[PDB]
Amino acid sequence: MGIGGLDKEFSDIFRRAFASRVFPPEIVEQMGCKHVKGILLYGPPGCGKTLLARQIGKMLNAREPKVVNGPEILNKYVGESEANIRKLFADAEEEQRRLGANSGLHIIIFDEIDAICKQRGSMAGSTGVHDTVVNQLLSKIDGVEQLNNILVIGMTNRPDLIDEALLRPGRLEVKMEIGLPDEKGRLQILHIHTARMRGHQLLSADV
Amino acid sequence: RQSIINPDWNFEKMGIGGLDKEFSDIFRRAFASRVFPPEIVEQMGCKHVKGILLYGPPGCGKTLLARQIGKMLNAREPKVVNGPEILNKYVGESEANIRKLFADAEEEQRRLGANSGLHIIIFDEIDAICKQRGGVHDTVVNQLLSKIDGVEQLNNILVIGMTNRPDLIDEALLRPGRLEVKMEIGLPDEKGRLQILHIHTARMRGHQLLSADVDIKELAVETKNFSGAELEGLVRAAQSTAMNRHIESLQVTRGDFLASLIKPAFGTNQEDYASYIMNGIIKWGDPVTRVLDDGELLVQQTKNSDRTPLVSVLLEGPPHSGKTALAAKIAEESNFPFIKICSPDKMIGFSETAKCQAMKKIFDDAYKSQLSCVVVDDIERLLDYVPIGPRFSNLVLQALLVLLKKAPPQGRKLLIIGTTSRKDVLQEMEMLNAFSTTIHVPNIATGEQLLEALELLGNFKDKERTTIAQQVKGKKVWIGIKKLLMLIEMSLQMDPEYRVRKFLALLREEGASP
Amino acid sequence: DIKELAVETKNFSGAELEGLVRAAQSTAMNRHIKASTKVEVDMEKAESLQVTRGDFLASLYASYIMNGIIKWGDPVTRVLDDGELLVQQTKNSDRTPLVSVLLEGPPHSGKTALAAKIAEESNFPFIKICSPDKMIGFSETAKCQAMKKIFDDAYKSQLSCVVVDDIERLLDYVPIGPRFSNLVLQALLVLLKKAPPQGRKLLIIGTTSRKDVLQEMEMLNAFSTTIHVPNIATGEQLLEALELLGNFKDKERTTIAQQVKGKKVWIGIKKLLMLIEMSLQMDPEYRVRKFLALLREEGASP
Amino acid sequence: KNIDSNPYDTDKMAAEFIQQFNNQAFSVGQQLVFSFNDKLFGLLVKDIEAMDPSILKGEPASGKRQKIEVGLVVGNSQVAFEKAENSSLNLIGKAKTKENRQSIINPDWNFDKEFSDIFRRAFASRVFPPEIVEQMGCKHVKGILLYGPPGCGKTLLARQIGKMLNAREPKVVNGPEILNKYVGESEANIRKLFADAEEEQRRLGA
Amino acid sequence: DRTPLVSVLLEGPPHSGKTALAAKIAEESNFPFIKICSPDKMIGFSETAKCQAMKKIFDDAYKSQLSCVVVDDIERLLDYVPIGPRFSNLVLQALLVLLKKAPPQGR
Ligand SMILES: Nc1ncnc2c1ncn2[C@@H]1O[C@H](COP(=O)(O)OP(=O)(O)OP(=O)(O)O)[C@@H](O)[C@H]1O
Ligand SMILES: Nc1ncnc2c1ncn2[C@@H]1O[C@H](COP(=O)(O)OP(=O)(O)OP(=O)(O)O)[C@@H](O)[C@H]1O
Ligand SMILES: Nc1ncnc2c1ncn2[C@@H]1O[C@H](COP(=O)(O)OP(=O)(O)OP(=O)(O)O)[C@@H](O)[C@H]1O
Ligand SMILES: Nc1ncnc2c1ncn2[C@@H]1O[C@H](COP(=O)(O)OP(=O)(O)OP(=O)(O)O)[C@@H](O)[C@H]1O
Ligand SMILES: Nc1ncnc2c1ncn2[C@@H]1O[C@H](COP(=O)(O)OP(=O)(O)O)[C@@H](O)[C@H]1O
């Protein structure tokens, strides 16, 4: 698929998260088990996280993903960041309301999530500036009305600054690490990126 | 008049377990007067209750309860507000949005009187709107107060709220005649866990997709201090693991459950134990044993006593004597369901207030279990002490001293283990008056102990051992365990011929008066 | 009896009374609902419906006084009599609506619990306790705000009693330097002399464990009087306390007396309790020896 | 059931209104129905200013427009179409009229390179034969921004880049010339700009 | 394997040439990751900012498999002056804590 050096990580993801999306529907319904709702990825920049997300999205015949850079989402005026967050779910809500249990899955691709989800202040008078945004996200991900055609993928770099309510078994219960590649991965990457030149015969033998 | 409860409803179909007492209380205080025959109620001249509040820690089933309550009643569909979706940037828009919610109720009241049906409104994360007064938020709160109870009287509404921080809500919204029925959903006990497992494992049992070897009772016994979310996740993960093997005769066995057995939030972390005890424990002398015994005694005191719910005892040690390892070992051997370690290496660059908040979060958190153990290490590093001056942070000291003598809620028990390396300064700080007792950890003081430790570590050969004995048994020594390991590691990098000599030389250079 | 209910209900708002009636009626109705769990049903007994006083009882200090109070000697009676005298003085006087007192003694003497007992026996309608347990991590300004609110709440009653606990912890005192918080001290000193609006009465009780430090701060001139709380000082008294608690039986009591009776002691009750708890954890036939060893190791240093 | 949110060109709808209901009586509060783009609209008259009688006399208006309980549409009358708040029907036209909203809003509270190095990083690819650049499909620069206080230097530079390369006669727009009192015509000038580019790209290819 | 963390201090009179020798040793190590933290690049920073900078460097260092780091002028990072003496405590606490924390297992 054009990604090399993270076979173990993808094997774990496929085993833990997407086993029920391929196993025949009849027995899945016979069990009565829900699907995982989200996953989190963290690591140094430039290691190929977005590429992995897009490939995962393409794998399951999903629709075009919605991808948004974290920062921007926040407005400067009042009662605006929450509206922007809520705008992302209108299509899924409408599609579910129309098609019942047939409606197809949807995608969410948050970016630099740690910039918009921080621990809410428990002490009185020491509340954070952006607690309202976190509250809105918490209400949207899992609320009174159930959505069964959505999947969420968060990317971050500071997993110890994230609010603890986003990691309970109901939200984003799967975690993985994408570290720097080792020698074999470097070799594979070199093959992948030099494939074009090799095909058109610009890769010398002295190289 | 139509009844207010569907004929098909029964408790068993709600799929809620471990909250029998709370559900009975809620029904008693909220629905008794709306199901009793109307004529007697007309003879009592009483109004109906107007609000309910539910609160608690994450993953206990509040939203589930709210939804089921919503679908239990014979009313029409309830209007739902998902968090702060009513705020707006323009003047007077949010107040209008608030007023929109009660229009149908007011209209029906005016039109029909006592024959109207019931209306329900649900607020999620209500703490984002109602805060203690003292401009725009205050106006929103006042509008809500005016609408709920104003000059014109309403009699057919019920409101349900949910929150995670019940201590930040304004006092004027929480009086009788308003949301007055307050309920607490807390962590469940073993029987509730069994009930929950029964709820979530009914369909599988019907279709014989469950192996006969699995015993639900064993699973119930093993999972201590679990909440509902973990109990559901365990089943989901087990099913996924079982399915993975086949990539018709599928069943779920005990092995799958064992392998699956998630890291609960209020549980015990094994990675912490792995990190703080790196090289195991070597019995180089009696004092170790004595220490362990003492620990045993303390544990046995805290588990069975009723008159002493809180105990304290910090431990000292000559630099590099290995206090933290012993403390972690004691904590591991306590066998309590809740264990945590507070260390200063997670607070690099923090200010005073951040550290205070972290400690308060730790403490408070632990306060919700029947048995807790917490370890605080390197007290001098926590206080940011430097001998020149001296200088230090007073606020942290005051916070720790106050926390050292606060009893938990009724019926709960806590144990605290402290570690330090400068006992004289601590005595000077008037901190020893809050601790029940003390234990002493000594250094290595004889050649015999050194020889036993050397044999136990197993680095050098027998001839080198005899050589070491020849020169080291002629006097006494003064060395810590960690420094000894460091010296051995440094020495093993030389050529084989000179090693022993270097060892002795280094020991001759490190030596200092006790 | 409505009059009995009126006597029982002190400091109830109009809404609380309405709520009490509403709760009582709901509880009364709840008897006749039989099978809410299986299927909602009503019984024929609804006709014989009545509201009883048991329902009122159901509808209608443990944290600070945990292990009670035992009369282990004479001083306790003296303290209680002085407290009663002070309460009587504050209730039936017109020329002095504000009076203050300080209770002092050696550390670990259990003074706050005794103050709580005095306050409970005063039988005044309004009693509140200000404790550092609700001010962990607060900044000094917030502490002042909390104190101001607490004192303001007391002017809306005809009779008020307030207790300040662990004064030394409120000031954030440490012997080195020394170093302390000036703002709280200034607030408290100014706040101990403002009389309420004419016709209302207030009493203030304060607990501390180091009188010399407070004396150095020129604080002892603001209080009106002082009371002393002593330690346990004789073996006979220790035997009496042991007898009252009822832990070690006579056979061991004789052996213990044979030793302690010919010596002097210096100890607080709370530490004796902790020693007792530690000693009980050993085997049945080593306990007396450990108790005596711990008692010896304690020390006196009067 | 017919709602959509795209803009309707609505000066047409006013001209059509004047054409269809010419010489008719109209009064305040009156309700009626209208049709455009084969979509149906409900209408409610809210205010009526007469002409100043001077205009009827052939003289400049004083601005003393009387407000009248009933008015007569005549071949030069005009009309405005303000939306009821709840709505999606986007509208424009230009003369369809929308008084400036004068509404308070509350905030939120709280809170370079050498020109040869430029040739290197922007123009090295474009000079080569198509074959080799296609070989590895190099990406190309197409956006350059210059910032600096006012002065002729930037324009002189612009002409120098115009000179050095074998480029067409440059097209230059001075400020927001696209903006037109015909709203909706601002975008039209834009599409007009790239017609020649589209033709050449479609004709000469690479 | 039993001692994954090691420390060493070079001391001598002024102008002896300590920095040069430290750099030479670092060069001769032949490890994949080398970085140098000196106060020359933190001119005008407030104390909190300096703490953040050190934190970033060490956090990045934990991601490699073999790391070696050199700190040049401790007396300049602590802002020490003989009168008093007077200094900033926060940096002292940061250095003291960092000298004992081991990386994750195997690094
Ligand atoms: N006792 C229980 N019986 C049945 N389901 C339970 C129980 N406890 C938890 N759950 C599970 O909890 C899930 C939803 O939890 P929910 O978020 O409603 O709880 P909460 O306490 O409101 O959470 P939070 O405070 O994190 O928002 C449901 O899937 C439900 O199956
Ligand atoms: N029986 C033992 N007693 C003490 N330490 C032991 C024992 N066996 C092994 N050790 C090793 O001793 C080391 C404990 O060092 P640790 O870092 O906890 O020291 P400390 O006294 O807490 O503080 P400091 O590092 O500041 O001197 C660990 O490497 C541990 O494996
Ligand atoms: N006669 C008594 N007087 C006071 N306390 C008594 C008496 N008899 C038993 N007690 C118990 O002794 C304990 C008093 O301890 P408390 O915590 O009040 O001490 P304290 O004065 O705050 O001491 P310190 O702060 O110095 O530890 C309580 O458990 C109380 O119930
Ligand atoms: N063999 C050598 N030993 C020491 N220094 C040498 C040697 N050969 C050359 N030098 C030069 O000596 C100088 C050492 O100066 P440097 O500033 O590193 O000293 P320093 O002890 O770090 O002092 P400072 O506190 O001023 O930084 C360098 O310019 C280095 O090139
Ligand atoms: N293992 C890999 N295989 C293929 N491409 C990779 C790999 N690692 C990185 N890349 C490159 O990373 C570039 C950007 O990827 P992206 O996921 O956006 O990185 P970042 O983590 O910085 O967002 C892509 O152009 C891609 O070619």
Numbering used by the authors:
A (entry chain A): 218 to 424
B (entry chain B): 205 to 338, 345 to 457, 471 to 484, 488 to 740
C (entry chain C): 425 to 484, 499 to 740
D (entry chain F): 105 to 215, 224 to 318
E (entry chain A): 532 to 638
Sentences from the paper on this structure:
SNARE (soluble N-ethylmaleimide-sensitive factor (NSF) attachment protein receptor) proteins drive membrane fusion at different cell compartments as their core domains zipper into a parallel four-helix bundle. After fusion, these bundles are disassembled by the AAA+ (ATPase associated with diverse cellular activities) protein Sec18/NSF and its adaptor Sec17/α-SNAP to make them available for subsequent rounds of membrane fusion. The disassembly requires multiple ATP hydrolysis events in the presence of Mg2+; as few as six ATP hydrolysis events are sufficient.
We observed a similar coordinated opening of the D1 and D2 rings for the mammalian homolog NSF after processing substrate. Sec18/NSF transiently forms a split-open conformation of both D1 and D2 domain rings in the resting phase with no substrate.
